[model samples]
Target: SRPPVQIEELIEKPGGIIVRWCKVDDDFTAQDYRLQFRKCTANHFEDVYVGSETEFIVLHIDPNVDYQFRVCARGDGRQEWSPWSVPQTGHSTLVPHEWTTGFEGYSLSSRRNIALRNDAESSGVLYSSAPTYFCGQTLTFRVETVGQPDRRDSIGVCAERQNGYESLQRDQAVCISTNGAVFVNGKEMTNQLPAVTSGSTVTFDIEANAKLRVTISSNNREVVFDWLLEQACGPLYFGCSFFYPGWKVLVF
Candidate 1:
């Protein structure tokens, strides 16, 4: 009679891979077992190990690569290994990307006269030309502004969808001094409840799925907001706002 056996979970590990299986054979006629692994990019099979244990670990495997495995039994006094069993394949995980600094331009409009500058004072409105694109994912923005306390300010991201316009509004976007404030949208957000502080930097993130979501982190606190947009095709806008000198916006 054939030996009773069943293969269970096949797990992927860092250095190699692990295979767990169950054996229900009544007779202990089998002396040992053999495990094999083959790469998806290759044609032939490679013997991983030969053992009587049910669990086997194969090492020195590459990440983000696909591989297949098989197992067989060996009867007592048998010189050759048994025929290879069914095969199972799996792919490894990929590494995440690293972050970098420096502003790279994507798309912007000329109407705002908003050009990215290495120096904040001469750049007019410190803006990046690149328009952060979204496809149902989260986006983060960091804005640097200069102004005084008690002044209005705003900051946020803007996008154009198929239906309407979508924007993440930030008021009193930043605070530079004591009497004045930096604003992103229309609200006075500096030094107020849920308002970002002055002379400091603000960090915000947004999850844009069907519409758009914006998450703001400032003064060691955080808040989230979202908006539904109209018009699927065409241009999208993003930037900061201040009361007196008008506002600066970037379009893509």
Candidate 2:
């Protein structure tokens, strides 16, 4: 029978990409395997070897570029490497911005007083009392904050089934701070959060069954978030909270 073969799931993490594959053909006479990677547009493969190893990690990748990868086994030095496996390509950037423009739901806005709290310890500035609407497919909120170092504030979307405030389901919140920090389901996500800068526009795209993705571009840097998850539904709500000193919130 063909060598018992398995391809592991591709892990896309912050600052690097990890790929794992396994083969259970112990009796097969094989010395090692050679892995190769190259740009999709390129014609030649950049030899990246795992030499009988089952897994490999590709590091120092260009965040904005896509890559094509393939692997093959090789016998001892006497024989040539086996045929290459099927090619697979992946991108490091977050989902495109065009995907978030489909939100056709209602819009609302509200404000919470926070003059009695400290800048860092304060709950930041909260925007509430806004209108809410379910856009049937997905909900999108556009938030703008006026302050220096605009990237230091936190903006997020929240959802609930009931009208009044209640315990929110875990992972029901997707938040992005001015420092290019992303929080989903209450977990800090490094790979999906792009770097943020002042006077820049940051767009976040969240799908019900898909990962929370973000794109932040400023100066000469562009970042993307490409996390994946399951679909989410129900009466969805959104809010923008700011954490900068003397910062104000506005929704548009």
Candidate 3:
């Protein structure tokens, strides 16, 4: 019987993640390593990257979504690889990719100087496709502050109302503040958050579940906006308003 292995570390990075583990070997010969992974939303473990060393840098993975990974020993000397390592999981900050817009609420529609692009604008250039996500999912995006320093701006990950104009301004969101504050459903979260400024990038995460779990991370500071409310769920799309020109969609 082969001895089981364990994953030692799984660290999330800006654009990707790094996975490392303890060495797997016998009193015998040399062997390579195999790292396999599957997204939490996916079904099976797909081979991501393999190498002769014990560490692997998985680049270009979807952020804000959970992923399962396992490592094993393999190489030229041995025909049969080690049994397999215990699976470890981690998620990076939600970064943007191709962005699309849907929430037809007048509250959002009333806002000005905001433009939304779904995915790299390669497929749908001008509002053709809307990104679809479910309840109990986390949506992530970054705000780039440049040239619009003094002008104030904020970001929201909100749920959509079936009827466009009926929803209030902030009823369905977990929002990050420009002045280092957090808001849940139009109300300011009592906790103090670090101030996010222009020319800086901030990652906003909204865990869309029964009670929303909101987190805002900028540089070394991170704050959670813990609030519970009746918000939007099921068959949701991207909802945001910004005065700045930099924002992207990350799929998790």
Candidate 4:
């Protein structure tokens, strides 16, 4: 028996995203495919769209709200299905500058970390404005360096569960850095991978839902991890921690 099917990729955009995958088997016997999704903190997946198309765009979804997505292959005649794809999550960056809506930037005097401001100011880690929030949601962000070449610019995306109005790294988060470093809790991310360069635009796709799953990708590298938060607390934010300078860019 074949194992569970995995889609080729899932990418985030302004309002929604597109899901894409290649043929299921080498025999090219697969006919139709199904896409399933859950919006905000939805606990269950609603059967959304299905057809013979290799790609489908889901529009009119809440841009800042977290989303869960998955797909599966179907046999045209026998009505057989391979296992469902590994669940992937993504959310769009809100327009009209939602980052400036004001979360306290910690240690402003010391500049320990920065909260991206409005007016060509910068940011990501898509979020909410209301009192009631999605406990199970994924936040996604994309960034590229200041266009300098040859030198390393380090940056990280971390899970911030306990926000102290301003403190960014004092407590509760698993940060993955671009210089191949993985920081558990407040300490530095220890494990290192292939270093990133100027040519790369890094993308951080983080699921703040129950199990903290992080996927980081660039032109040169891709890393996905499932981490159990030591604190496992509520109201998380995917905080951007830059060891160097970069612009929060939209990935095409």
- What TM-score would every model get versus the actual structure? 0.36, 0.35, 0.42, 0.39
Full-model lDDT, candidate 3: 0.53
Model 1 Cα shift for residue 183 (angstroms): 52
Error of 4 at 66 (Å): 16
Residue-pair clashes per candidate, as listed? Answer: 42, 15, 12, 5
What digit string (tens of lDDT, one per residue) describes model 3 on residues 129-224?
243443333444443323232122345555553233211225665555556566677677677566654344456554443665556676567787
Residue 74 miss distance in model 4 (angstroms)? 13
Comparison by lDDT, 1 against 2, better one: 2
Per residue, candidate 4 scores C-alpha lDDT tens digits across 1-252 of 452356677767654677786665676467777888897588789767788777777654775688888887777685877778778887865433223145332112122122332233223232222211122223333443333321122344334433332223333454444455555455554445555544445555554435666666655566677656654534344444332333333222
The prediction achieving the highest lDDT against the true structure is 3
Estimate every model's Cα lDDT from 0 to 1.
0.44, 0.47, 0.53, 0.50
- Model 3 bad stretches (over 4 Å): 1-142, 145-153, 161-169, 207-209, 227-236, 242-252
Candidate 4 shows a clash count of 5
10 residues in a row with least lDDT, candidate 2: 96-105
Ranking by lDDT: 3, 4, 2, 1
1-252 per-residue lDDT for model 2 (tens digits): 353334555666433456666655666567787677887778888877667777876754555677887777766764766666666786553321111211112122223211111244432223333324222222233323344444435555555322332212126655666556666655676544444433344443332265545443333344555544454433334544443443433332
| Candidate 1 backbone clash number | 42
> Which candidate has the highest TM-score of all?
3
Task: Rate residue 64 of model 3 by lDDT.
Answer: 66
